[PDB]
Amino acid sequence: GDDWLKKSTKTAVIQLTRAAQTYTPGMNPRSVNPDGTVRLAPPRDWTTGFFPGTLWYGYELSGDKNLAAEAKRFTLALDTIQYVKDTHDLGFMLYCSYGNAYRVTGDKIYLKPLENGAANLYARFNKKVGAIRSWDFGHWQFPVIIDNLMNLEYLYWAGKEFNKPEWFDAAKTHAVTTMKNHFRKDYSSYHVISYDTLSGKVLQRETHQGLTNESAWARGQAWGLYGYTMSYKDTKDKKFIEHAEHIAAFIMNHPAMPADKIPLWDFDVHNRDRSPRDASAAAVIASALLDLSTQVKDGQKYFKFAEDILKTLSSDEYLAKPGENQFFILKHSVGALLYNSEIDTPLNYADYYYLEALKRYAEIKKIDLKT
Numbered sequence: 001g002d003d004w005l006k007k008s009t010k011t012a013v014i015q016l017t018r019a020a021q022t023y024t025p026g027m028n029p030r031s032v033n034p035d036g037t038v039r040l041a042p043p044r045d046w047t048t049g050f051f052p053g054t055l056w057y058g059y060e061l062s063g064d065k066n067l068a069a070e071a072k073r074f075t076l077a078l079d080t081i082q083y084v085k086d087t088h089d090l091g092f093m094l095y096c097s098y099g100n101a102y103r104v105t106g107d108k109i110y111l112k113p114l115e116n117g118a119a120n121l122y123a124r125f126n127k128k129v130g131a132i133r134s135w136d137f138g139h140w141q142f143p144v145i146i147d148n149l150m151n152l153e154y155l156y157w158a159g160k161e162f163n164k165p166e167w168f169d170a171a172k173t174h175a176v177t178t179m180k181n182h183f184r185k186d187y188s189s190y191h192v193i194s195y196d197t198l199s200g201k202v203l204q205r206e207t208h209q210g211l212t213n214e215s216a217w218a219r220g221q222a223w224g225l226y227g228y229t230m231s232y233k234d235t236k237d238k239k240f241i242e243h244a245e246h247i248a249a250f251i252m253n254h255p256a257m258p259a260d261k262i263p264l265w266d267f268d269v270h271n272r273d274r275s276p277r278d279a280s281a282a283a284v285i286a287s288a289l290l291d292l293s294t295q296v297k298d299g300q301k302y303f304k305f306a307e308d309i310l311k312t313l314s315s316d317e318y319l320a321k322p323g324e325n326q327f328f329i330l331k332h333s334v335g336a337l338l339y340n341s342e343i344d345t346p347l348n349y350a351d352y353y354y355l356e357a358l359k360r361y362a363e364i365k366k367i368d369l370k371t
Contacts (some may be wrong), residue, residue, distance in 0.1 A: 002367055005358065008063050008314040009369045011322050012329050012355060019327035020039035022069035024076030028052070029326065031335065031345045038326050041348065043080050050348040052078065055095035057355035061362070068104070074179070075101045075110070082116035086132045089149030090121040091333055096352065099154060111273070112133040118158035118167060121151065126239055129200045130177035134192075142195040145208065146182055146220045149168055149175065149227025156234035175231045181205075182224070183308040187243075187250040187268075188216040189224045189310070211334045216267035219235040219334075221251055229288045230280060238285040244292055245258075251285060252305055261309045265334040279318055280333040280350035282309050287357040290364065303364065311363060313354060320346070330354055 023029050023040070030041040030053040042049040055071035058064070064212040075097045084090065102110035125291070132152075134145045152171040154337065159168025171369055179203050181193045194204040208364070210217025228244035251257065256267045262282040264275040289306035293299030312318060317346045325331060328346030335342025362369055 004311055004314050005362065005367060006369065008319055011090070012351075012358075013058055013064060013067070013371065014322040015325075015329050016055055016070070017064075018323065020055060020067070020368060022327060023051070023074075025074045029318060029328065029348060030328050030370045031323045031333075031347050032328070036246045036326075039342075043078055043093075044084070046087065046092060048078060048081070049093040049095070049097035049297045050352040051078050053100050054165075054348065054355055056097075056100040057352065057359055060104065060370045061355065061359055063359070071101065071104075079113055082083045082113035082120075084138050085118075085120050085123065088121065088132050088145075088148045088151045089126060091154035092349070093117075093297065095151075095154035095157070099157065111327070113188055114158065115162055118154060118162065118164075121155055121158075122164075122167045122170055125174065126197060126199060129195045131174045131195065140192070140194045141203065142197045143308075144174075144178065144182075144195065146178070146189050146191055147223045149178060149231070150223055152227065152229050153234065155299065156231075172231070172235050172342075173238065175227065175235075179228070179239070183243075187246045189220055189247075191217055193222050199360065206233050209338070211266040211268055211338070214268070214269035215252075218263035218265055218278050218281040219284065221247070221263075221267065222281040222288070225251060225292075226284050229292045233291060240322050241292075241295055244288075248289065248292060248302060252301075260312045261305065262312055262332070265337050276334050276337065277332055278334040278354065279313060279330050282313060283330070283353035283357055286310050286313070287353050287360060290360040291354050291355060292348060294364065307359065307361065310357060338341060 006268055011045040028048050030039045030047050033039055052071055052074035055067055059067040059071055081093050098110045098114050124136040131144045134143050134148045155167050155171035182189050190205045191207045191210050196203055206213045225247045228240045232240040254267055256272055261320050262277045265278040267273045286306040288310040289302040293303035325346055329351040331346055332344055333350045337343055
C-alpha cells in the first residue's frame with residue numbers, strides 16, 4: 001500500500017510549515033549541531049539554496065499555497081548569489097532555489113538572477129581542461145570534484161533558456177571529461193581530480209570527504225549516478241545513460257550496500273555493521289534511480305531499489321516526527337566524517353532530494369498527495 005508515502009508527505013508539510021515560520025529568510029536551516037542548536041546557512045554557504053528548494057517541492061506535493069508563499073520569501077532572500085563568482089555551487093545555491101521557483105511559477109522576478117548566475121557559472125569552465133573549476137582555494141591548480149556534476153543541470157537549462165549554446169556545450173563537455181577521469185575501472189568514483197590548467201592533463205586523483213584517495217565516498221557515488229542520469233535527461237546522449245547504468249550496478253550490487261539500502265558513509269570502511277549511515281546519499285540515489293527507471297529499456301529493478309530506499313527513509317528510524325528534529329524532515333546524514341563535521345545529523349540537502357524522490361515516485365505511480 002501507499003500509506004507510508006501519504007503519511008510521510010503529511011509530516012513533511014508540517015515540518016516545512018513550522019520551519020518557514022521559525023527560520024529567517026537569508027539564514028537557512030542547514031544541520032543540527034552536537035549541542036542541539038541549528039547551524040544556519042547564509043547566502044555564501046553552499047547549502048543555502050536547499051531549504052527554499054524543499055519548500056517549492058513541499059508546495060508541489062501538497063498544493064499548500066502557504067508553502068508557495070514561504071518558498072517565494074526564502075528564495076528572494078538569496079538575490080545576492082547572482083553576483084558570486086568563486087564557486088561551482090551556483091547550481092545547488094541558485095538553481096535549487098530560483099530555478100525551482102521559476103519552473104513552478106513562471107514569474108519573471110526569478111529570471112534575471114538566474115541569467116546572471118549562469119554566466120558566472122559558465123565563466124568557471126576552462127576550455128583547455130574541458131571542465132568547470134570547482135573552487136579557487138587551496139593548493140590545487142585546478143580542482144574538479146564529483147559534486148560538480150550536479151551543478152551542470154543549471155547550465156543545461158540556462159543554455160537552452162537564454163539561447164547560449166556554449167553554456168549547454170560546456171556543461172556537456174564537463175560531463176564527458178568527468179566520465180573519463182573521475183571513474184575507476186569498477187565505476188567507483190574519486191572525489192577530486194586535479195588538472196593542469198594549460199595542458200588539461202590529470203595531475204592528481206584524490207579524496208576530499210571520503211575515507212581514502214582510493215575509496216568510494218557514498219554521497220560522491222550518488223552525485224555521479226545522479227549527474228549522469230540528469231545529463232542523459234538533458235542531452236539525450238546515450239553515453240551518459242550507459243554510464244549511469246554502470247554506476248547503478250556498482251552501487252546496487254555493492255557488497256557493502258546494507259540490507260536496508262541506506263549506504264555507509266563510505267562504501268570501503270572496514271566496520272560495516274557499526275559505520276554511520278548517510279541518509280543524504282540514499283536520498284540522492286533514490287531520486288536518481290527513479291528518473292533512471294523511466295529512461296532505460298527495463299527500469300523495474302531501479303524503481304524497486306528506489307522504492308525500498310524510500311520506505312526505509314520514511315520509517316521511524318529516518319523520518320522525524322512532526323515538530324521534532326528542529327523541523328528537518330530526515331535524520332542520519334553525514335557531512336564530512338574525517339573532519340568531525342556534521343556526523344549523524346539532519347542536513348538540508350537530504351530533505352531536498354528526499355522530497356524530490358517522493359515527487360518522482362508519486363508521478364510514476366500517479367498518486368495524488370494534495371492536502
